[PDB]
Amino acid sequence: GYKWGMSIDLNVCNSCNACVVACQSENNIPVVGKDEVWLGREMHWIRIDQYYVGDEHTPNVYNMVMLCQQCEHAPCEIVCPVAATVHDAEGLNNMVYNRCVGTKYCSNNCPYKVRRFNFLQYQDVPYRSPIDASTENDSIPVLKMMRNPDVTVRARGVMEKCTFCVQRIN
Amino acid sequence: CLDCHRNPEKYVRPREEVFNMAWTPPPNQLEVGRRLVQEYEIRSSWELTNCAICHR
Amino acid sequence: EPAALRPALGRLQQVALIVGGVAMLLAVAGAFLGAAQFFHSYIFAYFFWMALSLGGLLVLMINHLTQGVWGLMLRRLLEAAALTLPLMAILFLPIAAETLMGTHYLFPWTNPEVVANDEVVALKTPYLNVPFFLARAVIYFVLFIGMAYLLRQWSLEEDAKGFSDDLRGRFQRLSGPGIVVLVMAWTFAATDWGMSLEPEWFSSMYPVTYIASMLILTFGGGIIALAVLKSRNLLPFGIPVDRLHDLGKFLFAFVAVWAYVNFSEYLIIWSGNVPELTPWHGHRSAGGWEILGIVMIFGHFLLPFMLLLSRFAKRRLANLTAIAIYLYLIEIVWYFWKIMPAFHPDGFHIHWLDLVTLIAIGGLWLGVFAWNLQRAPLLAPNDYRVPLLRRQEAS
Amino acid sequence: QVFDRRANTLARVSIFAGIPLVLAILGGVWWLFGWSDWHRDVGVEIPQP
Amino acid sequence: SAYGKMLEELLGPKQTYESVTRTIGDIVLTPIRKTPWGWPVGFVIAALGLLMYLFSLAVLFTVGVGVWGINIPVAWGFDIINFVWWIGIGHAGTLISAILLLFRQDWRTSINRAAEAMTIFAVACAGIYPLVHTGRPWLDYWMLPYPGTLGMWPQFRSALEWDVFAISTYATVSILFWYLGLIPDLASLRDRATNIWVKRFYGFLALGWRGGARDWNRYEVASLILAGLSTPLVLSVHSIISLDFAISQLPGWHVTVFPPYFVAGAVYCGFAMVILLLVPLRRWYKLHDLITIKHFDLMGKVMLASGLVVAYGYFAEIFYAWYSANIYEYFLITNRTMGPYAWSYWALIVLNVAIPQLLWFKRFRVSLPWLFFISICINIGMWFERWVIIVLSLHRDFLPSSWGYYTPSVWDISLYAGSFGWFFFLFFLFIRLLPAISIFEVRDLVHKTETEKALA
Amino acid sequence: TLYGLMAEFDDAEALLAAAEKTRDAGYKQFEAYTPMPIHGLDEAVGYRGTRLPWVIFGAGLLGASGMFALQTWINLVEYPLNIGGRPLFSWPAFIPATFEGMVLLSAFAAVFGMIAACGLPRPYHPVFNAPNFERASVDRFFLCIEAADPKFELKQTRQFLESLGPLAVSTVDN
Ligand code: HEC
Ligand code: HEC
Ligand code: SF4
Ligand code: SF4
C-alpha cells in the first residue's frame, strides 16, 4: 500500500532554505534560542548540508538536503524501549510523539542524525527563554493560530523527525 | 479503538444504516460484518493499527 | 604409580598414530581427487585440534595461576594437550603450503583477482598478505610452543628437583603474562586462519568465541581423559567425587560462557545488520547451515545446560563423561558450522574428508598427546596440592 | 526473650493476609485509576450551558 | 601445610568466634554519640552531596533534560557515561560476593559485605540514570510490561528495554543475595545487642534465623545457587548495558567484543572502587585482623586479570576498526588518537594500559598507597573509557554535517558529583547500621584455619 | 509447657561428633544450632538434602518460559509491530529479557523459597528462651532435642545428653 517514497534531486538544491521553513510552518517545529542552537539542539527536521570539496581558497560547494530517510530497515526503531517510533504499512517511519519517554537513544542509532529532540520546552522560545519552567505550560495565545491543527505540538522530552508530512498523507 | 481496528467485523454495519441509532448488531454480527469488510475494502489489522492512523 | 599406565598410553600412542597416519594417507589421497575440498576440510579439522591443543594451554596457565585441586588432576592432561603445539605447528605447514602456492584454495586474499576486484580486501592487504601471514604464523608457534615448553621444563623440574616456592613463583610469573600473550597471539591467529577465510567480513569476539570453546574442549577432554584412565584403572589417584564436580562445574560454566559469546556475537550482528558484519551469519543461516545453527542453540547450549545443571550429571563420572563425549560431538559440528561455510556459503556442503581429515589430525594429535603423557608421572608427585589431593580421596 | 509469642501470628498474617491485602490495594487503585469507567467520565452527564 | 599457609594469610594472628564477632560487633552496636568521628563528619559531607543530588534532579525534572549540555549528535552524555560507570562499579562487588563463592575461595569472606553492599549502593546511583536521562521521566513505567488499557507494550528489541530488565533484576537480586548474607549476621547483632529496640531491630531483620542444623543447609544451597545465578546475572547485566551500544550501527559502538569487554571493564572499575573503599575501612575502622593485606594482593590481581581484558579490548577495538575497511571506522581510530577529544583516548591508555600495569609487581600491590593510587587511576580511567565509547564515538560519526561536541553543563557535574552523595549516604548508613564485614563467613575461615592447624 | 532439652558445646568438632550421635541413637526430632555452617552437620543430623534447588529451577523455568512467551506474545499475537523491519518473532532480542526473567524468578524462589523452607519469617522460636542460647549465634554450639519424638523422657534423655560431652544440658521451656 502506497509505498511512500521521496526522490530528491541534489543537482538543483540551491540551499534556498525554503524547505527548512516549509517544514516549520507545516509541522509546528519550534524555534530554539541561539544559546541552545550553539549546543546543537536546533529543531529542523530537514537540513541542507554544504560540504566544500577541496581547495579551501576556491572550493566547489555541494548540497545534500538531509531529512529522515524513512528507512525500511530503520535502525532508529529497534532501539526505542517503549516502541514509540515504529514503521508503517505504508512504508515510512512513524514517530509517535506521545509514546516517546525521551530516552533519546533513537538518535544515537540513527545513522544520519536527523531525529531532533525537544530537550527543554521548546515552544515560543524567542518569546520565553526555554531554560525556565514557570511558563513552560503557558502558551502565547497569538502563536497558537500559526500552528497546524493536524500536527502534534510537541512537549519537552519528545524526539521528532521528518515524517514525510503524515498530516498531508493521512 | 484498536479493538475495532484489529477486528472491524465485530462492529462494522451497513453504510445505509449508519445514522439509524436503533441498530442492534445481528446475532451473526461476524460473517455479516466479515462480509462488509470485503464490501468496504476495510484495511487489515496490520495497516490500521500502526501509529499513523491515529497519532499523526 | 600404576604399572599398566605406560603400556596403556603406549598402545594409544601407536594406535592413534596409525589412525592419524592412514587417515592422513587418505586425506592426501582424497586431495588428488579434489584439491580444493582437502584444504577446505583440512582447515576445519585444524581448528578443532588447534583450539584443543591450545585450549589445554590456556587452562594450564589458569591451573598454574590458581590453587585448585582441579587441574592438579589435569596438570599432565593439560601439559600434554598443550605440548601438541609442536605438532600443530608442523600440521600447519599444509595450510602454509597452500598460501605459498598460487591456488587460492584457503584464503581469497591471496587471489590477485580478489585483492584487485574488491576494495574491502585490498585495504586489509597490509595485514593479509603471504610474507606477513607466514611471519605471524611462525610468531604464534614461537609463543604457543614456547609457553607450552617453558611450562613443561619447569614441570619436569618440579618433579625432579622438588617443589620450591621460587618454582611456584616462576609458573605464575609466566602464566600471568602468558595468557595475555596467548589471547593476543590468538586474536591474530583467528583472524589469520579463521576470519580471513571471509576477508570481506570483520568482527571482534570472533577470536573470543573460540577461546570460550577452547575451554570446553580442554575441560570436556579433561573429564573424558580422566574417565578413560579411571574406567581402565590407570590413574595414580582416585578421583574425588567433589573435585569431579569441580570439572563438571567448569565444563558447565563454559558451555554458558560459550553460549554467552556466540549469542552476543549474533545478537549484535543481527540487531544492527550492517552488511559487512552480516555475511557471516547470513551465509550460516540459509541454505542448510541453519540446521547446524539451531543445533548450536539447542544441542550445544540448551541440551548441555539443562543436563549439566544438576549435581547428578556433574557428580557421577559416567553421566559427566557422556556429556563431555557429547559436547565433543557438537563442537565438531560447531567448528564445522563456523569454519566450513566460508567455503560453499550458499548451501550446506559436507564431504567425506570432513570425517577423514578430522580423524587424521586427531590421530596425530592423540598420538603426540599420548607420547607427551608417558614422560610425566600423571600426578607431579612434588606438588603443593597433591598433599591436598591425598586427602579428599582417602576421605 | 525478645519478640513475645504474639509476634508469630503478627508476622504470619503480614505475609499471608497483609501481602495479598496490599496487593489487592495496588490493584484496586490500578483498576480505579488506570482501567475503570470512572476516571474516564463514562455515563457522567457533563453539564452544558 | 600448603593449604594452611594461604588461610593464615587472610586472618590475623589469633582469632576466635567471639573475637571476629566483637571486632564487627563494635563497629556496629557502639552507641550513638559514641560512634567514631569521621563517620558523622563523613556522613554530613555525604548528606550534603545528597542535597546536591536531589536538587540537580529537582532542577532536571522541572526545567528539562536539556540542562545537561547534551547535543543532538551526542544525545547521550554524562547521564549514560555515569550510568555505565556506576553500574560498572557494582559488578565487581558481586564478583567478590557471588562469583568467588563458585570458586569456594576464602579471600572473599572479609571483603564480602563491603563489596556486596557496595554493589547495591552503586546500583542505587546507577538505577536512577535510566530512570532520569529520559526526557519524560514520569512515563518510565512504559518500559515495563503491564496490561495498561492501551494495547502498547514495551518493545523487547532495544537494550534500553533489556536494561530495565537487567537493572531491575540486578537490583532485586543483589539486594536479596545481600539480605540473605545478612540474616545470620543480623542474628549475631541481635543476640549481642543488649539493648531493647536495638535487639528488636536486628531481631526483626534477622527474621527468626535461629542458627539451625537444617536452616544452615537450606542457606548453603540458597547461597550457592544465588551465587550461581548472580554469576551469569552480572555477566549479563553489564553485557546488556554493553548492548545498548553494540546493537547500534555506529562505528565506535557496533564493536562486537563489547559484551566480554564491558563485563571485563565493569570488573576492572569495580575492584578499583572496592580497594578505594576498603583501604579506608581497613585503616580507620580497626579491621586489620580481618581484611589482611593478602586480600588486597589478590584483589590487585583480579583487578589485573580484568584490566588486561580491557587493555585487550582497547586493541580488539583499534585493530578491528582498522581491520574493517570502512571509511567510518578508519576515522574512528583517527578521531580517538587525533581529533578534538584525542586527550580522552590518551588519558585512557595512560590510566588503564600504562599506569595500572604496576599491578603486575607485588611491590605495587601489597603497598597500599600504590594500590590506592592505581585504583584512583582506574576509576578515572574507566570513566574515560565510558566517555570514549559514548561521546567520542557519537560526536563524530556518519554524515559530517552532524558533528557535535558535548561540553558537559554544570548540571551533569552537580548530578554526578552529587551521585557520590547518594552512594556514601547509603554506604555510611550501611557501615553504622549493619556489619560492614561478614561475621559468620569470618567465623568460617577461622573454623577452617583451626581445622587445618589440627592436622599439623 | 515442655519443648525439649539442649546441650551447649564450646567447640564445633565436639558437636558434629555429638550430632553424629542422636541419629544412630534413634532420634528424629532434633537440630543443632551453630553460629556458622559446620561442614558435615547436615547428613549427620539426618537432613539428607533440601528440596530447594528443585523449586528454584521450577520457578526459574517458569520465569524463562513465561518471559520468552510474553515477548513472543507481545510481538506476534497481541499487537505485532513492524518496528525496524525486524521480524515479528525475533528469536534474538527476546533472550536477554527472558534470561533476566529466569534469573529474577529463580532468585525470588531462592530467598523466599529458602525463608519459606525454614520456619524463618517468625520470631519467638521455642528455643530462644534457653539460658545460654543467645550465644549460639556468636560462640557456642547447641543441640536441642524436641519433645515430640516417642523416644524422649525428661529424666532419661537428659542423662543421655550428659552422656555426650556438653557444657550445660538445659530444659528449654516454651
Ligand atoms: C470500530 C467500531 C472502530 C472503532 C472503535 C474505531 N475505529 Fe477507526 N476505523 C474503523 C474502520 C472500519 C476504519 C476504516 C479503515 C479504512 O482504511 O477504510 C477506521 C479508520 C480510521 C482512521 C483513518 C484510516 C486511515 O486510512 O487513515 C482513523 C484516523 C481512525 N479510524 C481513528 C480512530 C480512533 C482515534 C479511534 C479511537 C477513538 C477509532 N478510530 C476507533 C473502525 C473503528
Ligand atoms: C487508533 C486506533 C490508534 C492507533 C492506531 C494508535 N493509537 Fe495510541 N491512542 C489512541 C487513542 C484514542 C488514545 C487516547 C487514550 C486515552 O487514555 O485517552 C491513545 C493514546 C496513546 C498513548 C497515551 C499517551 C499519553 O499521553 O498517555 C500512547 C503512549 C499511545 N497511544 C501510543 C501509541 C502507539 C505507540 C501507537 C502505534 C504503535 C498507537 N498509539 C496507535 C488511538 C490510537
Ligand atoms: S530542496 Fe530545499 S534547499 Fe533545495 S531548492 Fe528545495 S527548498 Fe531549497
Ligand atoms: S530518522 Fe534516521 S534512522 Fe529513523 S527512519 Fe529516518 S533515516 Fe532511518
Ligand code: F3S
Ligand atoms: S529511543 Fe525511545 S522513548 Fe523517546 S526519544 Fe528515542 S524514542
